[PDB]
Scaffold this motif. Structure first.
Motif, PDB file in Angstrom:
ATOM      1  N   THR A  34       0.636  -1.242   0.255  1.00  0.00           N
ATOM      2  CA  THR A  34       0.170  -0.059   0.052  1.00  0.00           C
ATOM      3  C   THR A  34       0.763   1.176   0.143  1.00  0.00           C
ATOM      4  O   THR A  34       1.173   1.751   1.049  1.00  0.00           O
ATOM      5  N   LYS A  88       2.413  13.779  10.884  1.00  0.00           N
ATOM      6  CA  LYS A  88       3.032  12.399  11.535  1.00  0.00           C
ATOM      7  C   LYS A  88       2.288  11.340  10.738  1.00  0.00           C
ATOM      8  O   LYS A  88       1.136  11.232  10.447  1.00  0.00           O
ATOM      9  N   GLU A 118       2.022   7.350  10.643  1.00  0.00           N
ATOM     10  CA  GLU A 118       2.081   6.380  11.888  1.00  0.00           C
ATOM     11  C   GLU A 118       1.494   5.033  11.240  1.00  0.00           C
ATOM     12  O   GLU A 118       0.508   5.207  10.435  1.00  0.00           O
ATOM     13  N   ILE A 119       1.753   3.867  11.760  1.00  0.00           N
ATOM     14  CA  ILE A 119       1.186   2.560  11.634  1.00  0.00           C
ATOM     15  C   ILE A 119       0.646   1.808  12.670  1.00  0.00           C
ATOM     16  O   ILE A 119       1.391   1.589  13.785  1.00  0.00           O
ATOM     17  N   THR A 120      -0.643   1.756  12.818  1.00  0.00           N
ATOM     18  CA  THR A 120      -1.283   1.017  14.030  1.00  0.00           C
ATOM     19  C   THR A 120      -1.655  -0.554  13.767  1.00  0.00           C
ATOM     20  O   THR A 120      -1.964  -0.828  12.636  1.00  0.00           O
ATOM     21  N   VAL A 133       6.364   6.054  11.768  1.00  0.00           N
ATOM     22  CA  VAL A 133       6.977   5.593  10.441  1.00  0.00           C
ATOM     23  C   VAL A 133       8.104   6.704  10.265  1.00  0.00           C
ATOM     24  O   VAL A 133       9.346   6.603   9.885  1.00  0.00           O
ATOM     25  N   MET A 167       4.623   4.183   2.756  1.00  0.00           N
ATOM     26  CA  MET A 167       3.856   2.763   2.351  1.00  0.00           C
ATOM     27  C   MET A 167       3.788   1.858   3.328  1.00  0.00           C
ATOM     28  O   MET A 167       4.428   1.979   4.318  1.00  0.00           O
ATOM     29  N   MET A 218       3.403  -2.739   4.072  1.00  0.00           N
ATOM     30  CA  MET A 218       3.399  -4.005   3.628  1.00  0.00           C
ATOM     31  C   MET A 218       3.186  -5.068   4.693  1.00  0.00           C
ATOM     32  O   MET A 218       3.598  -4.867   5.916  1.00  0.00           O
ATOM     33  N   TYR A 244      11.036  -8.646  11.074  1.00  0.00           N
ATOM     34  CA  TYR A 244      10.170  -9.343  10.100  1.00  0.00           C
ATOM     35  C   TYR A 244      10.824 -10.473   9.424  1.00  0.00           C
ATOM     36  O   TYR A 244      10.188 -11.535   9.460  1.00  0.00           O
ATOM     37  N   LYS A 299      -6.810  -5.678  12.443  1.00  0.00           N
ATOM     38  CA  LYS A 299      -6.642  -4.783  11.126  1.00  0.00           C
ATOM     39  C   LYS A 299      -5.199  -3.850  11.477  1.00  0.00           C
ATOM     40  O   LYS A 299      -5.003  -3.376  12.671  1.00  0.00           O
ATOM     41  N   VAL A 300      -4.264  -3.843  10.578  1.00  0.00           N
ATOM     42  CA  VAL A 300      -3.264  -3.105  10.657  1.00  0.00           C
ATOM     43  C   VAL A 300      -3.330  -2.067   9.462  1.00  0.00           C
ATOM     44  O   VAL A 300      -3.610  -2.255   8.433  1.00  0.00           O
ATOM     45  N   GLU A 301      -3.162  -0.834  10.112  1.00  0.00           N
ATOM     46  CA  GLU A 301      -3.680   0.393   9.088  1.00  0.00           C
ATOM     47  C   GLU A 301      -2.388   1.370   9.214  1.00  0.00           C
ATOM     48  O   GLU A 301      -1.584   1.312  10.100  1.00  0.00           O
ATOM     49  N   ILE A 302      -2.234   2.063   8.161  1.00  0.00           N
ATOM     50  CA  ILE A 302      -1.119   3.152   8.110  1.00  0.00           C
ATOM     51  C   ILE A 302      -1.889   4.565   8.037  1.00  0.00           C
ATOM     52  O   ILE A 302      -2.677   4.684   6.886  1.00  0.00           O
ATOM     53  N   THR A 303      -1.768   5.423   8.965  1.00  0.00           N
ATOM     54  CA  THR A 303      -2.447   6.700   8.804  1.00  0.00           C
ATOM     55  C   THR A 303      -1.567   7.964   8.744  1.00  0.00           C
ATOM     56  O   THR A 303      -0.125   7.754   8.852  1.00  0.00           O
ATOM     57  N   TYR A 304      -2.035   8.837   8.120  1.00  0.00           N
ATOM     58  CA  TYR A 304      -1.553  10.275   7.761  1.00  0.00           C
ATOM     59  C   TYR A 304      -2.020  11.425   8.404  1.00  0.00           C
ATOM     60  O   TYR A 304      -3.269  11.747   7.979  1.00  0.00           O
ATOM     61  N   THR A 305      -1.475  12.114   9.247  1.00  0.00           N
ATOM     62  CA  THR A 305      -2.121  13.053  10.245  1.00  0.00           C
ATOM     63  C   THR A 305      -1.546  14.526   9.786  1.00  0.00           C
ATOM     64  O   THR A 305      -0.382  14.641  10.333  1.00  0.00           O
ATOM     65  N   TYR A 334      -5.160   4.586   5.636  1.00  0.00           N
ATOM     66  CA  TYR A 334      -5.340   3.452   4.669  1.00  0.00           C
ATOM     67  C   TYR A 334      -5.203   2.080   5.298  1.00  0.00           C
ATOM     68  O   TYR A 334      -4.484   2.283   6.442  1.00  0.00           O
ATOM     69  N   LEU A 335      -5.695   1.207   4.928  1.00  0.00           N
ATOM     70  CA  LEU A 335      -5.712  -0.175   5.499  1.00  0.00           C
ATOM     71  C   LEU A 335      -4.670  -0.934   4.783  1.00  0.00           C
ATOM     72  O   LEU A 335      -4.782  -1.293   3.702  1.00  0.00           O
ATOM     73  N   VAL A 336      -3.441  -1.413   5.751  1.00  0.00           N
ATOM     74  CA  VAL A 336      -2.624  -2.070   5.135  1.00  0.00           C
ATOM     75  C   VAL A 336      -3.045  -3.480   4.799  1.00  0.00           C
ATOM     76  O   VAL A 336      -2.709  -4.185   3.777  1.00  0.00           O
ATOM     77  N   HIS A 337      -3.846  -4.206   5.860  1.00  0.00           N
ATOM     78  CA  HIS A 337      -4.473  -5.266   5.800  1.00  0.00           C
ATOM     79  C   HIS A 337      -5.469  -5.636   6.903  1.00  0.00           C
ATOM     80  O   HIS A 337      -4.888  -5.602   8.048  1.00  0.00           O
ATOM     81  N   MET A 393       5.162  -3.953   8.290  1.00  0.00           N
ATOM     82  CA  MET A 393       5.941  -2.920   8.051  1.00  0.00           C
ATOM     83  C   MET A 393       5.656  -1.580   7.547  1.00  0.00           C
ATOM     84  O   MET A 393       4.800  -1.454   6.612  1.00  0.00           O
ATOM     85  N   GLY A 394       6.404  -0.529   7.969  1.00  0.00           N
ATOM     86  CA  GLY A 394       5.972   0.556   7.163  1.00  0.00           C
ATOM     87  C   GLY A 394       7.395   1.203   6.721  1.00  0.00           C
ATOM     88  O   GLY A 394       8.464   0.935   7.368  1.00  0.00           O
ATOM     89  N   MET A 395       7.257   2.237   5.729  1.00  0.00           N
ATOM     90  CA  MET A 395       8.574   2.650   4.940  1.00  0.00           C
ATOM     91  C   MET A 395       8.166   4.089   4.383  1.00  0.00           C
ATOM     92  O   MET A 395       7.295   4.168   4.070  1.00  0.00           O
TER      93      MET A 395
END
Ligand SMILES: NC(=O)C1=CN([C@@H]2O[C@H](COP(=O)(O)OP(=O)(O)OC[C@H]3O[C@@H](n4cnc5c(N)ncnc54)[C@H](OP(=O)(O)O)[C@@H]3O)[C@@H](O)[C@H]2O)C=CC1
Ligand SMILES: NC(=O)C1=CN([C@@H]2O[C@H](COP(=O)(O)OP(=O)(O)OC[C@H]3O[C@@H](n4cnc5c(N)ncnc54)[C@H](OP(=O)(O)O)[C@@H]3O)[C@@H](O)[C@H]2O)C=CC1
Ligand SMILES: Cc1cc(Cc2ccc(O)cc2)n(O)c(=O)c1
Lengths: 358, 367
Positions: free
Chosen positions: A124, A133, A135-137, A151, A162, A164, A196, B131-137, B147-150, B160-162
């Protein structure tokens, strides 16, 4: 003649197409009968049927368990003009691989007079417009905890980010498919982001010590890696194989593409020298697997015997030009050092007649 | 002797330290005078000053633009035992590369018996379903974009995030554009922006935007160019990739002025444990050597120093022709004849080979 059995086969394009048909007529058909499920994956027919043939072949391998593929043109715009394609069709290899799943295995076929290792490889994305910010939750289904990691804090400007993910089933299937592949070959298996790549190392050790001959298994790191082991992560002597997780379904194929340049000379009338060995071994691996699924001692023998002849022929000085240039250096190659496409096929047939007669 | 100028130099560890001093005493100093900014990055002196020496060098290269580094021990638990280290200090390269920024470039050195490649994490474990999500604030309190990573519904796994900022991507371009112009070589960028339509897309674009606004001129001015590609289709050019005693790493700062160079091999510990024991060794200096010539030749450019620039060029040639005429170390002889068949009369040891490069640098420069 051997009753080989039920085998799915897909025909290709251009130069590998010439070789495919030769292989059948001078090496396969004269010694083996197949209940043959042909599919014509040549670009013209794939276009004509709306990439439908491609889907039909894939479901067949899903059904009959064994597939061997001839190398096939994948369209970009230059091709679409050339064939006047009505769409730019996705690769058949991609198409086929989603429908079947599993893990590819590339093995170089080793000759004793030329300058084995089986390597098997295994989102994604969005634009962060301005500062803030990212962040990944992770929030478990039983609402017990929210774990959120940062992140990066964009303070500068914006940029890109992104996500993964990965489920256990996928990695368990990397393991099964890799351990099983080790016993079929009787070779040691090696498996080469702190947490990972870590989750990978574990499920391997867990499947190992739960189901999986004077063999073993080990782990490593990229840079730490005699020759003759399975490693989990000329061109015409490479043989990739897609192994499905269940252990039953298998698709075999050359690792090179359609060799267009050689085909363009073929059209022009010029003499060529295309290495059949990769395409050849695609057949024998699929036939021998057919033999395994059917307990077919006669066929299994034939498969190995043809892999033998192929290696012994090159080991005896009779070879094509890509191999002759690997031994002697390209600019130092004379015409009497190699055989052309049609002569090398003759020698294998002649040596297969004799080898199989004894 | 040639007036070289202002050059930072850092001494390293173990076998690279032995070879380093051989290079200065027998190949550099006898022909070149330098305003020398030495810093001693040995594990002891780094320990002793509390990795302070390491920081001092970075700001030093930051100031005088040209640096050459000898390979330096990076501490692990084992190293802390050997030296009784007071801490496990971060890599000197890690430290220095943060202070200066820029892009590394590894170029393989071709002997007839080249490609310059310059390359560019938050991982955690998903125990069970959820759910694992990645957000932007955004900073301006505007909407928070999720966004929903999965959604793991069966079981668990990993996620993971990058990230990557533009400043990061803009500095990749320059550093890659500068290096292409310094080399009079074509530049190619290999992304994978078919799969990652929005990520590497930002890479592909920021590259085409920099090319025009500043570099399309000077590129045609050397009959060279730049193009973009995709990894497997890319399969004398500068290769940017979004991701041994003849390998040479070089850090190019975006500004085009600052440059730090070094051999890409490490401190060669095994050969050093032999050196200590009193045994005969045979370690390849060409990489360590070529670090100097890239930094010296870069110095010469910034300062209009035809004298230095030639000398740099002249030494690099001496190194390659000395091997192309058969005198080499054991690693190279084992490349030619095969490892189990290497006889001693095929190769020279460390101290005989430095002699030969030195001898050939005398005659060459005499011409
Ligand atoms: N469906 C598939 O399985 C694949 C299909 N392709 C397709 O291949 C098409 C174009 O072919 P292309 O990728 O450029 O060329 P190839 O992939 O076929 O290989 C490139 C070069 O490798 C050499 N080579 C490969 N196999 C042999 C052989 N058996 N004997 C002698 N030499 C060999 C040839 O060298 P030399 O220069 O000396 O002649 C050839 O020019 C594309 O349109 C693409 O769609 C690509 C990859 C796999
Ligand atoms: N700070 C820096 O600049 C760097 C520091 N290091 C540090 O070096 C230390 C040890 O490095 P290590 O990985 O073991 O050794 P190296 O990375 O330097 O290479 C080890 C082996 O590769 C071969 N080799 C590499 N360079 C040469 C050469 N010039 N001549 C001949 N053979 C060569 C040798 O094999 P063989 O024995 O068969 O001859 C050698 O034993 C580590 O603590 C590490 O952190 C690592 C990289 C760069
Ligand atoms: C610790 C460290 C080491 C290297 C070089 C290196 C060489 C060989 C090897 O096996 C691993 C690392 N660099 O470049 C860094 O920034 C930091």
């Amino acid at each position: 003649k051997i009753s080989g059995g039920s085998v799915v086969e897909m025909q290709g394009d251009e130069m590998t197409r010439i070789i495919w048909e030769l292989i059948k007529e001078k090496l396969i058909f004269p010694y083996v009968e197949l209940d043959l499920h042909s599919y014509d994956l040549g670009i013209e027919n794939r276009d004509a049927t709306n990439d439908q043939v491609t889907k039909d072949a894939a479901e067949a391998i899903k059904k009959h368990n064994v597939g061997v593929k001839c190398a096939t043109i994948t369209p970009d715009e230059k091709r679409v003009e050339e064939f006047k394609l009505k769409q730019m069709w996705k690769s058949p290899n991609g198409t086929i691989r989603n429908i079947l799943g599993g893990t590819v295995f590339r093995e170089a076929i080793i000759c004793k007079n030329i300058p084995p290792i089986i390597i098997g490889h295994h989102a994604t994305d969005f634009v962060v417009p301005g500062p803030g910010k990212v962040e990944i939750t992770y929030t478990p289904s039983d609402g017990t905890q929210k774990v959120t990691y940062l992140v990066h804090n964009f303070e500068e400007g914006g940029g890109v980010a992104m996500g993964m993910y990965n489920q256990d089933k996928s990695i368990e299937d990397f393991a099964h498919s890799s351990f099983q592949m080790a016993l079929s070959k009787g070779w040691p298996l090696y498996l080469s982001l702190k947490k990972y790549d870590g989750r990978f190392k574990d499920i391997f050790q867990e499947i190992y010590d739960k189901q999986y001959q004077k063999i073993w298994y080990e782990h490593r790191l990229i840079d730490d890696m005699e020759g003759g082991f399975i490693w989990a992560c000329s061109l015409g002597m490479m043989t990739s194989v897609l192994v499905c997780p269940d252990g039953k379904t298998v698709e075999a194929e050359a690792a090179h593409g359609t060799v267009t340049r050689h085909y363009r000379m073929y059209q022009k009338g010029q003499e060529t020298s295309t290495n059949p060995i990769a395409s050849i071994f695609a057949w024998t691996r699929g036939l021998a697997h057919r033999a395994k699924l059917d307990n077919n001692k006669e066929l299994a023998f034939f498969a190995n015997a043809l892999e033998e002849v192929s290696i012994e022929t090159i080991e005896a000085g009779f070879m094509t030009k890509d191999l002759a240039a690997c031994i002697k250096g390209l600019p130092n190659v004379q015409r009497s050092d190699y055989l052309n496409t049609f002569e090398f096929m003759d020698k294998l047939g002649e040596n297969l007649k004799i080898k199989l007669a004894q």
